[PDB]
Amino acid sequence: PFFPPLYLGGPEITTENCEREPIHIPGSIQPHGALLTADGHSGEVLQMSLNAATFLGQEPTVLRGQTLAALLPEQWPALQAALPPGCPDALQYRATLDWPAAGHLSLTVHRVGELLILEFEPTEAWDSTGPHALRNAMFALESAPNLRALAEVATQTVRELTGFDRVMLYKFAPDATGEVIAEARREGLHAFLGHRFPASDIPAQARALYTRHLLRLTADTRAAAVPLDPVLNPQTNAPTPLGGAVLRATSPMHMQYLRNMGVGSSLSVSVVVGGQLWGLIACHHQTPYVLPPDLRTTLEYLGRLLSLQVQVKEAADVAAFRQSLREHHARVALAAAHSPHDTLSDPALDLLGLMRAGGLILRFEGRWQTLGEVPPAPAVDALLAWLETQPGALVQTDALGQLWPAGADLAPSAAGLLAISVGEGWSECLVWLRPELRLEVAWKDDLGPRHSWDTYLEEKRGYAEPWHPGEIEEAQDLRDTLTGAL
Amino acid sequence: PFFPPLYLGGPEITTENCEREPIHIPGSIQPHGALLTADGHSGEVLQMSLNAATFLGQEPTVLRGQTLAALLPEQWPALQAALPPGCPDALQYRATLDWPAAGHLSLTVHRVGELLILEFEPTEAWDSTGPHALRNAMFALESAPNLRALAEVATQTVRELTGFDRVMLYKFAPDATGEVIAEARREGLHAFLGHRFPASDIPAQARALYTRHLLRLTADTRAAAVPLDPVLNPQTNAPTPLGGAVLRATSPMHMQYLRNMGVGSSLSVSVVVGGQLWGLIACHHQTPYVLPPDLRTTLEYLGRLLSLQVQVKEAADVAAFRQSLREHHARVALAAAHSLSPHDTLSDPALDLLGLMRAGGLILRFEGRWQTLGEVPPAPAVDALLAWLETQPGALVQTDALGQLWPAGADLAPSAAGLLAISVGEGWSECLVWLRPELRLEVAWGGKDDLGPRHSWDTYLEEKRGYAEPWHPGEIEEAQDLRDTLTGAL
Numbered sequence: 004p005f006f007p008p009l010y011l012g013g014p015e016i017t018t019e020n021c022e023r024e025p026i027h028i029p030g031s032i033q034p035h036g037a038l039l040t041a042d043g044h045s046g047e048v049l050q051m052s053l054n055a056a057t058f059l060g061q062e063p064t065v066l067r068g069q070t071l072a073a074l075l076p077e078q079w080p081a082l083q084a085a086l087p088p089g090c091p092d093a094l095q096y097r098a099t100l101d102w103p104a105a106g107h108l109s110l111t112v113h114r115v116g117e118l119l120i121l122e123f124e125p126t127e128a129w130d131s132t133g134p135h136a137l138r139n140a141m142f143a144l145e146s147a148p149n150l151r152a153l154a155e156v157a158t159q160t161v162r163e164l165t166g167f168d169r170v171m172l173y174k175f176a177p178d179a180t181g182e183v184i185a186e187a188r189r190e191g192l193h194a195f196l197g198h199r200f201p202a203s204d205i206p207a208q209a210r211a212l213y214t215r216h217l218l219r220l221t222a223d224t225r226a227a228a229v230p231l232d233p234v235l236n237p238q239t240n241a242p243t244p245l246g247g248a249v250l251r252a253t254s255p256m257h258m259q260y261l262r263n264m265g266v267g268s269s270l271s272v273s274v275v276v277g278g279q280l281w282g283l284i285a286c287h288h289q290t291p292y293v294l295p296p297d298l299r300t301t302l303e304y305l306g307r308l309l310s311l312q313v314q315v316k317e318a319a320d321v322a323a324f325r326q327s328l329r330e331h332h333a334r335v336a337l338a339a340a341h342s343p344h345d346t347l348s349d350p351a352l353d354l355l356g357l358m359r360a361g362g363l364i365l366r367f368e369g370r371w372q373t374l375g376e377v378p379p380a381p382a383v384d385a386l387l388a389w390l391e392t393q394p395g396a397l398v399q400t401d402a403l404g405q406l407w408p409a410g411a412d413l414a415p416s417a418a419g420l421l422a423i424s425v426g427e428g429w430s431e432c433l434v435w436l437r438p439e440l441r442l443e444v445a446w447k448d449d450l451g452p453r454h455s456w457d458t459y460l461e462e463k464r465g466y467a468e469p470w471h472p473g474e475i476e477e478a479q480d481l482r483d484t485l486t487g488a489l
Numbered sequence: 490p491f492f493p494p495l496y497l498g499g500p501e502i503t504t505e506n507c508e509r510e511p512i513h514i515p516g517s518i519q520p521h522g523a524l525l526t527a528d529g530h531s532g533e534v535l536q537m538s539l540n541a542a543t544f545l546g547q548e549p550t551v552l553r554g555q556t557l558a559a560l561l562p563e564q565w566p567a568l569q570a571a572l573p574p575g576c577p578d579a580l581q582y583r584a585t586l587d588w589p590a591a592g593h594l595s596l597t598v599h600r601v602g603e604l605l606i607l608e609f610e611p612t613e614a615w616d617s618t619g620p621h622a623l624r625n626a627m628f629a630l631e632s633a634p635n636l637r638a639l640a641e642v643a644t645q646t647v648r649e650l651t652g653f654d655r656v657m658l659y660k661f662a663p664d665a666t667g668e669v670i671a672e673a674r675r676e677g678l679h680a681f682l683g684h685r686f687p688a689s690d691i692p693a694q695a696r697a698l699y700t701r702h703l704l705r706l707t708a709d710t711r712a713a714a715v716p717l718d719p720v721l722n723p724q725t726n727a728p729t730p731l732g733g734a735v736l737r738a739t740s741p742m743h744m745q746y747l748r749n750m751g752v753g754s755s756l757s758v759s760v761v762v763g764g765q766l767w768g769l770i771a772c773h774h775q776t777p778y779v780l781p782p783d784l785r786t787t788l789e790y791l792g793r794l795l796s797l798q799v800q801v802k803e804a805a806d807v808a809a810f811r812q813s814l815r816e817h818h819a820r821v822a823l824a825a826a827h828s829l830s831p832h833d834t835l836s837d838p839a840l841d842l843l844g845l846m847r848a849g850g851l852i853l854r855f856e857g858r859w860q861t862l863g864e865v866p867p868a869p870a871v872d873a874l875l876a877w878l879e880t881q882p883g884a885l886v887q888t889d890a891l892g893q894l895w896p897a898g899a900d901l902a903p904s905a906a907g908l909l910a911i912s913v914g915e916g917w918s919e920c921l922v923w924l925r926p927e928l929r930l931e932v933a934w935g936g937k938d939d940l941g942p943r944h945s946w947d948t949y950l951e952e953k954r955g956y957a958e959p960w961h962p963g964e965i966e967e968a969q970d971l972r973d974t975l976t977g978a979l
């Protein structure tokens with residue numbers, strides 16, 4: 004459940020109840036633009052930001068209670084044509100206005116229910132920066148060999164077009180955590196490459212909102228938001244949804260985070276693959292930065308292109324990895340034809356590198372042998388005894404401490420486990436073991452990157468590197484072969 | 490196998506041997522530009538088109554045997570940097586040049602093996618009426634309800650940006666055929682919406698070539714190609730691969746087709762999903778069109794974006810369809826709980842077992858007797874069909890044309906061309922058979938034996954004779970789920 008917003012008797016957002024914060028209805032916008040809401044049918048301006056009078060150059064009393072057809076006679080029909088009733092709030096229609104007071108303005112309108120939300124930012128007359136920018140970024144992404152090079156080129160490209168001090172790319176691991184897989188920074192800044200952060204750092208509502216709206220920015224981390232007048236929607240006397248508004252006021256908690264990082268401005272472009280938030284492009288600047296809408300649009304384009312390239316490169320990496328496992332598997336099967344303990348213990352066969360494991364346990368003919376980093380012999384006997392109790396032919400776990408409590412002490416030597424049964428039961432089996440996940444800092448007790456890394460390692464205590472799904476499939480495929488080779 | 494090109498003793502390209510045409514090595518370019526090839530390491534200009542001398546403004550003898558550093562000292566280092574050796578040939582590097590002879594030119598270079606292929610076209614700025622038109626179009630495509638709305642918005646958008654008289658989108662059916670699912674045309678032109686063409690109209694080489702390079706242009710369908718001098722690659726004395734070349738001469742067969750349509754210029758944007766050519770965006774104009782480089786960037790972007798979005802919207806259409814079949818399945822299962830007479834229960838028009846599988850006929854075999862619902866072939870043919878089902882193994886049988894799988898049933902094609910049978914009990918004593926009529930369609934325009942669109946539609950209908958509408962995967966899955974449901978009803 005969500006807490007009520009602060010302007011409706013809502014509880015104060017703290018570090019303990021930050022998950023239930025209604026970040027989609029702050030009732031306020033960022034001061035670098037102006038926001039208006041009008042009826043979807045009539046066009047009567049209802050809500051207004053307190054700074055819209057200064058931005059538009061028109062008195063606040065005159066603007067309210069005035070139809071959009073009188074204010075914007077050239078775009079109102081095309082606005083209703085672009086945003087039909089029932090359209091998703093993600094659908095945005097942008098047009099350029101020319102006013103004598105504020106110059107050229109960028110209008111961004113989206114429809115939420117029965118309410119049209121218009122956003123106003125200062126724009127350029129003609130933007131020739133973008134036509135070739137899209138060409139160069141697209142060509143740069145198309146010339147990447149693999150995922151790592153793709154991410155490096157992506158971050159460097161974003162930094163080149165924008166000028167941000169730091170541009171990073173997070174990948175979301177299956178456990179909802181994040182990891183900086185590539186980074187392009189200015190000379191003289193600590194590196195976040197390889198740093199990982201817990202899932203609690205990005206709340207659920209923030210992730211779903213990032214999936215529905217790919218771009219979201221925080222212009223000034225120390226600027227106060229500009230409320231809406233009125234704060235509630237006169238049509239329903241209910242909070243106004245600002246998830247689709249790019250001018251949405253950033254949550255005070257996240258602004259406190261960025262201030263604890265020395266970041267003045269932040270911008271995030273989502274990377275969605277298959278309808279899932281695969282990763283995120285982050286931008287950090289030490290000074291308050293407001294990206295112009297025309298160039299920011301180029302960043303959005305880059306968001307879509309990177310989603311496609313990540314899809315392709317991941318499919319190719321899993322294809323080549325699966326094939327490499329099949330060639331290694333053929334290398335083992337040929338040795339299984341002319342064969343058990345002495346055969347599989349051959350270092351030339353390398354059963355450790357097959358599953359990328361640190362330890363190996365081979366149970367055959369009433370005896371067990373080990374290879375690599377493996378817990379002491381009595382601990383091995385206890386582990387095999389527990390393996391016989393487990394049903395099925397395949398056992399897999401990222402952290403053996405959770406599935407086997409008495410095996411929590413042997414976690415640093417064997418945290419991840421992947422066991423298969425050659426014969427029915429567990430009389431003859433093959434067990435792969437992986438050590439505890441150990442990492443080092445990429446470079447205050449309060450919330451921040453330091454705290455985040457510390458709590459990330461504390462939350463993954465006892466865990467190991469997760470088993471790749473192709474290694475699991477290949478494990479069962481190997482079990483079926485060795486069953487018939489004896 | 491491929492036939493040798495015309496400049497190596499190759500046979501004349503006719504309508505009978507058009508499949509084996511080496512369209513990737515025509516040895517010539519289109520006359521609206523100039524093409525050069527140079528060594529990937531040194532930069533020595535090797536091959537040249539005979540019109541490049543007039544186009545570039547320098548004598549042909551002087552250009553050959555001259556390094557690219559001497560011709561273009563400003564772009565050569567960035568050119569070699571942008572196209573490193575080993576890069577894919579699909580990778581294109583585009584830049585604008587200013588020459589005193591021909592004026593401003595658009596350069597498009599790609600690397601094939603040890604050969605750098607440079608392309609020169611006359612250029613111009615491009616002013617789209619909507620500065621925000623591309624962005625608004627992007628959100629319009631992403632906020633599309635289904636695949637057909639997505640295609641409609643896509644075609645209309647392409648026509649708006651380009652100005653072509655006709656803009657269409659083909660979807661490639663599993664049987665490698667094509668179908669125009671959306672169209673944006675100028676007022677006063679016959680519609681191709683719903684028109685289908687056979688797989689033979691686009692050869693395999695053309696399909697793969699469309700997969701590797703998203704954009705393909707035919708400026709003038711009545712212009713003669715300009716050969717290369719020399720025609721072979723001096724490095725290997727082998728034909729020069731022009732699949733990456735945008736100036737590659739279009740096959741004479743396809744130009745003859747477009748002329749039979751009255752189309753002067755053609756432009757194609759490929760739609761690649763999962764490494765497979767899912768569909769294609771075609772543009773037809775009565776006048777030759779040369780796209781500005783900025784517009785090329787916009788179309789390529791729409792190619793990739795549509796490649797991404799079509800996958801999403803199609804997956805969503807299959808999700809909603811499967812959900813509709815799940816509700817339809819539950820409504821029948823509730824009637825299977827309270828059973829009185831199985832034959833009378835499934836024959837209920839309120840349950841609508843015909844609309845469940847989108848079938849025209851239904852055969853219900855239980856307790857040694859069989860009943861029918863809807864358009865069903867005569868009774869003795871039904872007895873023969875059920876006996877053939879007893880010969881057939883498995884619990885589920887599916888076919889688009891039963892005449893191929895069962896020869897003696899070819900005569901029953903008009904009443905039941907497609908077949909989907911499930912066995913309630915083990916064996917075929919009790920079974921359920923869905924039947925679909927022969928695929929019948931109508932012309933896209935509604936009013937010549939030579940090569941053209943009409944010919945394509947006619948040969949498409951002759952190749953789909955005896956065939957029916959293919960079974961949607963959700964209908965098959967729901968069929969097996971229904972077998973598992975009805976097994977426990979006994």
Ligand SMILES: */C=C/C1=C(C)C(=O)N/C1=C\C1=NC(=C\c2[nH]c(/C=C3/NC(=O)C(C=C)=C3C)c(C)c2CCC(=O)O)/C(CCC(=O)O)=C1C
Pocket residue numbers: 018021022026198199200201203204205206209219221252253254256257260269270271285286450451452453455456
């Ligand atoms: C439970 C409350 C929150 C804690 C604690 C916290 O750290 N953030 C909390 C709420 C929100 N985070 C939002 C966006 C966001 N958060 C991160 C987290 C990081 N974790 C790290 O370890 C590091 C660096 C070492 C970071 C930066 C990121 C990357 C982002 C998105 C990027 C960006 O927009 O700048 C968030 C969303 C608000 C909004 O934009 O509307 C909330 C709320």
Ligand SMILES: */C=C/C1=C(C)C(=O)N/C1=C\C1=NC(=C\c2[nH]c(/C=C3/NC(=O)C(C=C)=C3C)c(C)c2CCC(=O)O)/C(CCC(=O)O)=C1C
Pocket residue numbers: 504506507508512681685686689690691692695698705706707738739740742743746747755757771772941942945946
């Ligand atoms: C076996 C030779 C060919 C016959 C016969 C033929 O009709 N085309 C043949 C070869 C090529 N076709 C190429 C592209 C292409 N072909 C079609 C087919 C159509 N089917 C139709 O119903 C219609 C019109 C109503 C057409 C035009 C299409 C749609 C296309 C794609 C481009 C376009 O729409 O014009 C082709 C490749 C040419 C190249 O690479 O430049 C060859 C070769």
